[PDB]
Structure formats: C-alpha cells, structure tokens
Design a protein around this ligand. Structure first.
Ligand SMILES: *[C@@H]1O[C@H](CO)[C@@H](O[C@@H]2O[C@H](CO)[C@@H](O)[C@H](O)[C@H]2NC(C)=O)[C@H](O)[C@H]1NC(C)=O
Ligand SMILES: *[C@@H]1O[C@H](CO)[C@@H](O[C@@H]2O[C@H](CO)[C@@H](O)[C@H](O)[C@H]2NC(C)=O)[C@H](O)[C@H]1NC(C)=O
Ligand code: NAG
Lengths: 33, 36, 48
C-alpha cells in the first residue's frame, strides 16, 4: 500500500469445482452455475 | 531503511460475501451461443 | 506460404492445423488472445 487514503480490499480462496458457463452470441461469458 | 509504523488502532477482522464473483476464461478458444 | 483462396473446397494448413473445406468471410470478432473458434462438437469452425 501507499502512505501520506480511502481503500478497501477483499481476499478469497479458490477450490477445484465444476462450473457451467454461458457464452452469448458475441463470445462473452455472461452467466455461470 | 525499514520503519515500523506506530499509532494504528487494532480492530477485529471483518467478513463479507462474494455474489457470483471471480469467474475467468478457462482457455483461449472462441465459443459463442453455448453452455460449456 | 501460398495465397488465400475462398469459396472452394481446399486442403488447408493454418499454423500447423490441417483440414479440408470451404473458407468464407466471418462476422465473428475474436478477442486478441484467441486464434481458433470451436463449435458444440468441438471441431474448429473459425480461424484468424
Ligand atoms: C520492527 O520490529 C521488528 C520486530 O517485529 C524488528 O525485527 C527484530 O529485529 C531484531 C534486531 O534486528 C531481531 O533480534 C528480531 O529477531 C527481529 N524480529 C523479527 C520478528 O524479525 C525490526 O528490527 C523493527 N524495525 C525497525 C526497528 O526498524
Ligand atoms: C465467515 O468466516 C468467519 C471466520 O471463520 C466466521 O466468523 C466466526 O463465526 C462464528 C459463528 O458466528 C464465531 O463463533 C467465530 O468466533 C467467528 N470467528 C471470527 C474469527 O470472528 C463467520 O461467521 C463466517 N460467516 C460470516 C457470514 O461472517
Ligand atoms: C453483441 O454485439 C453486438 C454488435 O456489436 C452488440 O450490438 C450487442 O449489444 C452485443 N451484445 C449482445 C448481448 O448481443
């Protein structure tokens, strides 16, 4: 961080999972299960 | 040189919830109009 | 490398990937980090 200001940060941890991803007609992921 | 910062109030840690966050593209193949 | 010929069935080699078929102009827009496009049956149907 830096010193002299308003900041907030969040940390989470990844696990091996199976996801169902949705691709629209432009190729972007818009939803997941 | 290293300086140990003082004058910092200690507080209990805080938690929150991730609402369907953290999804990334698994590979580099283009796909469209599909459930994968 | 040879010339690019369209609208005819032609054996093709793209960056080492070989196949047969007919090439047409596409409206798909690839993000900069991708090179091939694949359909539901997982076969390659688009190429930059
Ligand atoms: C900030 O505080 C740490 C203590 O957490 C100091 O590190 C210690 O330094 C002494 C002397 O070099 C060592 O005997 C200890 O083992 C160190 N402790 C740890 C946990 O490493 C550090 O020197 C301080 N920084 C300053 C005074 O600038
Ligand atoms: C998120 O995780 C934290 C850390 O495990 C949970 O905090 C604990 O909650 C239980 C039950 O309320 C307490 O008995 C523990 O003392 C808490 N630990 C700490 C370090 O505070 C928290 O409940 C979890 N869920 C939410 C919604 O915050
Ligand atoms: C897809 O691309 C078209 C053309 O750029 C754009 O108009 C549209 O908003 C995009 N998104 C969707 C969901 O169709």
């Amino acid at each position: 961080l830096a010193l002299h200001g308003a900041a907030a940060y969040y940390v989470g941890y990844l696990q091996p999972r199976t996801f169902l991803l949705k691709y629209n007609e432009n190729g972007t992921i818009t939803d997941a299960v | 040189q290293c300086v140990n910062l003082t004058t910092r109030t200690q507080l209990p840690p805080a938690y929150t919830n991730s609402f369907t966050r953290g999804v990334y593209y698994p590979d580099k193949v283009f796909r469209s109009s599909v459930l994968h | 490398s040879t010339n690019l010929v369209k609208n005819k069935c032609v054996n093709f080699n793209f960056n080492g990937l070989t196949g047969t078929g007919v090439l047409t102009e596409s409206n798909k827009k690839f993000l900069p980090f991708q090179q091939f496009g694949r359909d539901i049956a997982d076969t390659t149907d688009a190429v930059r």
